Design a protein around this nucleic acid. Structure first.
Ligand SMILES: [Mg+2]
Ligand SMILES: [Mg+2]
Ligand SMILES: [Mg+2]
Ligand SMILES: [Mg+2]
Ligand SMILES: [Mg+2]
Ligand SMILES: [Mg+2]
Ligand SMILES: [Mg+2]
Ligand SMILES: [Mg+2]
Ligand SMILES: [Mg+2]
Ligand SMILES: [Mg+2]
Ligand SMILES: [Mg+2]
Ligand SMILES: [Mg+2]
Ligand SMILES: [Mg+2]
Ligand SMILES: [Mg+2]
Ligand SMILES: [Mg+2]
Ligand SMILES: [Mg+2]
Ligand SMILES: [Mg+2]
Ligand SMILES: [Mg+2]
Ligand SMILES: [Mg+2]
Ligand SMILES: [Mg+2]
Ligand SMILES: [Mg+2]
Ligand SMILES: [Mg+2]
Ligand SMILES: [Mg+2]
Ligand SMILES: [Mg+2]
Ligand SMILES: [Mg+2]
Lengths: 178, 261, 145
RNA sequence: GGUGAACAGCCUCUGGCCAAUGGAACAAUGUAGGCAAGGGAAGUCGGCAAAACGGAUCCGUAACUUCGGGAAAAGGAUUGGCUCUGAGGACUGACAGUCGACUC
RNA sequence: CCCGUCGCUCCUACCGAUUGAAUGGUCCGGUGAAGUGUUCGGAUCGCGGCGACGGACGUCGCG
RNA sequence: CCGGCAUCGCGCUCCUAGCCCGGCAUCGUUACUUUGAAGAAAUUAGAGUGCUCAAAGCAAGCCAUCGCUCUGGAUACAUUAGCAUGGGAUAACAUCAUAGGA
RNA sequence: UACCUGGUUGAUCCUGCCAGUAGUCAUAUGCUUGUCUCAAAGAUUAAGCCAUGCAUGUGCAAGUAUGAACCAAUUUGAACUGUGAAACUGCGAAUGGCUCAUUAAAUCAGUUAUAGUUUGUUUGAUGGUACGUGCUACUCGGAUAACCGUAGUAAUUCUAGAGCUAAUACGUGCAACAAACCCCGACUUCUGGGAGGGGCGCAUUUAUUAGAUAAAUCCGAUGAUUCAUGAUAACUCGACGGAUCGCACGGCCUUCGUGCCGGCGACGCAUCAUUCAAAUUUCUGCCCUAUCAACUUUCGAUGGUAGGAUAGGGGCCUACCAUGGUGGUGACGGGUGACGGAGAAUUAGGGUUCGAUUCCGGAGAGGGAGCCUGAGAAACGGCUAC
């Protein structure tokens, strides 16, 4: 089947390469899992070299997302794919791969920001002193969604994980999604 | 091939076993163990070849199945167990003990010793590093991993190791001025004293070692193994005191033994 | 910025630009400070690498690559690829029968960081890294023009 | 006007006509126009007549040659509708705004 | 001493209409077994809920 | 044959550092030679050893050829490429005249 | 032993070849042949084709024995006892043996690298939490061989149905602290707090943070790491964290109760290290040929960025982008009666020629291809298709 050998390639000079060997299993590839964004959740195991196991996520609906400036990580649900820096056709088909741009619920992160009298206040005034809250991340909350970037390998581990966009990286994609 | 190799044909065996090229088609294949199978001596060789307590492959099998033989403190049934440098081989039935150390000609010797030297061995540390939950531990070149060592034992150092309580009972800080026995190359066995170490960023470092009687030689840091702090050893050197020599000299020695005989 | 010229926004791994608490005084790659690294073996990281703004995952001083293996010197032969050069190695091959020499050569592709600058026929020292493409296994460390 | 490369063919608007003796029926033989299983030039002086091919895009193209050709040689693949994506511009005050008919 | 045409005999190779013949390989195009992964599918098979009903059922549990 | 040095021998803080002192590392690159490392064995050369000799083999030999003694199983060559050490004759490539030199 | 002799002439001195003269771990052939030691042998043409037979199975005191036997044989309460065949289970059969067809920087050799990976096994170390509202463990599931018996098919380790019965096979399910820190947080007083009680093994994925200098208390490693490793926030429909098996008895009661103990071991799960290994990988090196001067690039050719896949690096593959890569120092292409080396013959030196073959590396099993199992195979004394 699929192979990762260099034999079928042309030499760097451009000359042909003859085949002195057959294809080996230690050299194989597998065809992708082209992971979907859909509520019919499904991850499927792979038996790989060494008797180890990998996870093909075929359909994924919820993820684990980090808000780094706040150092808060909460599970949320995946709403839709909005930008994919390799191929537009992954956006149209709503495929989850590493470095895809996705909007997420914002519901868990709004409530953590809602949190954080006598004992409780005399910390809530300690906090609320350093609030900055860029108007960009504020406006998204008013819309009910957060731009996020996947940073896991869903076809490799079976999880959609990522981080809320901030600062330059939020600003850059926002100009693109315009 | 499509997997491991389980046979050792005789011509392919390590030269320092002194197996004879017509004594059969294969050799004992050293099992996986604490020593690197090219710097080892299996048990089969020690019994049948050297000690001659046996005449065949099957006879050495039986001896171990009575369990007379113990290695490094523990009873070993394996026929091709990879005994190595500074192991102890002890047969309580005969009541005998051996350290495994090199000839000047670079071949393992069973060095007969008392009980009080059987209590301990020497090991050089491969590395010291943190582990699970930051619990310091060290690699030796004998496969052993000792957790909670002195924070003084750094890499390349040597340790005394009681076989009863099993933890570090002493250690030598590998550096210039101590006596060393070489465990590889053409200089293996030759003992002497570190006179200089010149390092080379991104390569192996070279050790300069001088026999007690002047002769100077060099190895790379891999094949070095401190025995004692300073000139004195912490182990009993073999039948020749680690001093290698010209071919003329041993020619002279025989005829010098052949003038008295 | 000028680095950001692609369909993805370019950033260094594990450097967090939007940090709540920042300090220039900390180690590189912390508190928003550009990561930069010592390659070892006696080479010096150029200032343009240290206080650079380019992103290059393949750079010795800032990327994810480790120099190890062999260290070759040679002459730049062509500088017409994106961040890669071909360096010509010149050497003499002994012809045993005639007890004389002949001039042979080898062309070695090596990755060049944005921090350097090479023209046609400049003295370069390259270092071996993991394969970076079909033919590239070396990384330019010094350029003597 | 539409289709289209097109003053091609085909349909339409302005303008012009339905002027070509009518009715009934639907035999042979004609004349003009089609289609035919299996075979495929056996027909015939002779492939006469007919059939097959045919536009455009991509690929590929031998002998021979006066080196200009042969060449659209030969030989292949594609082609609707619908829903999208990218590229290629103008003006006005590496930007912002507005506009924009067309091609791939 | 000696050269070449010509006549006769043999040997080897050359050009040569014959869209000559055979064999093996390769480029492209057409068809495309079988496997592998994906999508529906669901024969039947496991607590055989419940209705608390009279080994029988359907509401069924998810696997 | 050679260290170790003075002549009109560009430094050393950092390691080796003598009883104020030898013997310091980066601010041009190489070939060439010197020594070493690390180099599979079998084969080649070569030591020992009276398989009766030899081709071979890696043995065996003395003891009271008596409850064991003594053991051996050396060593070398290995073109080129790579690593390290000193030499710096010879021979390459690069380069002090905008002084942007020390 | 660094060596020559015959042949052009009427004779001479040359050039120059022909011929002789020696060997081959170099093959066949012919004639001949008494003894001892030694040992090559269907490689060359046909990697052409095969009748028959064998070459891979396996059992311990230590997973499972009334399924039918054997030897003790029972005092007829308990034993299937002691030995066992079959059979289920686990492991192995990926090594070795054979050959050299394809293969010309390719395999291969010396030499590198992995900080870019997997690794059954060995050896060493290591292992808490399953849910209980972590205020100390929370209960035991049917059904399948050997066997009994009904059968089909010409058919063979072709095959169906019913009746039993085992588990270290299969599936569940009890779990060991201060919780060590961290977040809420009734009230208390005002907090820099005390806080009642709710949330935390190990793995997995992601993110944040720590992992320290330089001379007038900083503390692991490398030539070099955002390294080792720690803290935190969560995430998983978790692979895991013992319902297993031997002999040996031998301290003492708490109800004197196989009574509380507590030993040495056999097997097993998980992380790190090691070992046996591979997979890629750097530099240099290979025969003849120019009547083979350009080759590669649409459809991967050379690089870039993002992904996907892999055990992992990489145009390995995908989308977008750029126009590169090799070549008289011979690219590309052709020939090879071409696997590479260690080596072999011959040797004054320098050389010339050989290397299928017993060691090492590679590759293949009639030709192609695709796979399952497994730590390891693109396996052929495994399967699937042509
Ligand atoms: Mg073995
Ligand atoms: Mg038109
Ligand atoms: Mg018209
Ligand atoms: Mg017809
Ligand atoms: Mg006709
Ligand atoms: Mg006719
Ligand atoms: Mg006719
Ligand atoms: Mg005619
Ligand atoms: Mg006609
Ligand atoms: Mg024509
Ligand atoms: Mg050199
Ligand atoms: Mg001669
Ligand atoms: Mg003449
Ligand atoms: Mg004559
Ligand atoms: Mg001759
Ligand atoms: Mg094999
Ligand atoms: Mg273990
Ligand atoms: Mg790329
Ligand atoms: Mg990539
Ligand atoms: Mg061949
Ligand atoms: Mg052959
Ligand atoms: Mg055959
Ligand atoms: Mg094979
Ligand atoms: Mg096969
Ligand atoms: Mg067979």
């Amino acid at each position: 089947g699929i192979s990762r050998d260099s034999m079928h390639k042309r030499r760097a000079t451009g000359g042909k390469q003859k085949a002195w060997r057959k294809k080996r299993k230690y050299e194989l590839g597998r065809q992708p899992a082209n992971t979907k964004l859909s509520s019919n959740k499904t991850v499927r195991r792979v038996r790989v070299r060494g008797g180890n196991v990998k996870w093909r996520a075929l359909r994924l609906d919820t993820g684990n997302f980090s808000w780094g400036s706040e150092a808060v990580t909460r599970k949320t649900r995946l709403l839709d794919v909005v930008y994919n820096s390799s191929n537009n056709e992954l956006v149209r088909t709503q495929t989850l791969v590493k470095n895809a741009i996705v909007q997420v619920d914002a519901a868990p992160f709004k409530q953590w920001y809602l949190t954080h009298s006598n004992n409780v206040q005399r910390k809530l005034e300690k906090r609320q002193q350093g609030r900055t809250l860029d108007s960009h991340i504020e406006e998204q909350f008013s819309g009910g969604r957060l731009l996020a970037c996947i940073s896991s390998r869903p076809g490799q581990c079976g999880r959609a994980d990522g981080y809320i966009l901030e600062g330059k990286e939020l600003e850059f994609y926002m100009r693109k999604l315009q | 091939a499509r997997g491991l190799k389980k046979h050792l044909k005789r011509l392919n065996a390590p030269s320092h076993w002194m197996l004879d090229k017509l004594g059969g088609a294969f050799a004992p294949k050293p099992s996986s163990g604490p020593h690197k199978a090219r710097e080892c001596l299996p048990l089969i060789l020690i019994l049948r070849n050297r000690l001659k307590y046996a005449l065949t492959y099957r006879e050495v099998q039986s001896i171990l199945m009575q369990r007379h033989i113990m290695v490094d403190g523990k009873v070993r049934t394996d026929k091709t167990y990879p005994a190595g440098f500074m192991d102890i081989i002890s047969i309580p039935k005969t009541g005998e003990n051996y350290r495994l150390l090199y000839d000047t000609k670079g071949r393992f010797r069973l060095h007969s010793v008392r009980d009080e030297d059987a209590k301990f061995k020497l090991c050089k540390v491969r590395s010291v590093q943190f582990g699970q939950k930051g619990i310091p531990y060290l690699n030796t070149y004998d496969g052993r991993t000792i957790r909670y060592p002195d924070p003084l034992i750094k890499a390349n150092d040597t340790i005394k190791l009681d076989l009863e309580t099993n933890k570090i009972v002493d250690f030598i800080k590998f550096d210039v001025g101590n006596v060393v026995m070489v465990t590889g190359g053409r200089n293996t066995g030759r003992v002497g004293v570190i006179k200089n170490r010149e390092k080379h960023k991104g390569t192996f470092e070279t050790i300069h070692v001088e026999d007690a009687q002047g002769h100077q030689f060099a190895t790379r840091l891999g094949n070095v193994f401190t025995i004692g702090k300073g000139t004195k050893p912490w182990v009993s050197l073999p039948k020749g005191k680690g001093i290698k020599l010209t071919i003329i000299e041993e020619q002279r020695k025989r005829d010098a033994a052949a003038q008295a005989a | 910025m000028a680095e950001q010229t692609e369909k993805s926004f370019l950033k260094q791994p594990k450097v967090f630009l939007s940090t709540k608490k920042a300090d220039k005084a900390k180690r590189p790659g912390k508190a928003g400070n550009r990561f930069w690294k010592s390659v070892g073996l006696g080479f010096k990281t150029p200032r343009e690498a240290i206080d650079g703004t380019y992103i290059d995952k393949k750079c010795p001083f800032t990327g994810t690559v480790a120099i190890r293996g062999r260290i070759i010197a040679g002459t730049c032969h062509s500088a017409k690829m994106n961040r890669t050069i071909i360096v010509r190695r010149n050497y003499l091959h002994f012809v045993k029968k005639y007890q004389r020499y002949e001039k042979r050569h080898s062309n070695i592709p090596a990755h060049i960081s944005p921090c350097f600058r090479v023209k046609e026929g400049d003295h370069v020292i390259i270092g071996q890294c993991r394969p970076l493409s079909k033919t590239v296994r070396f990384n330019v460390l010094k350029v003597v023009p």
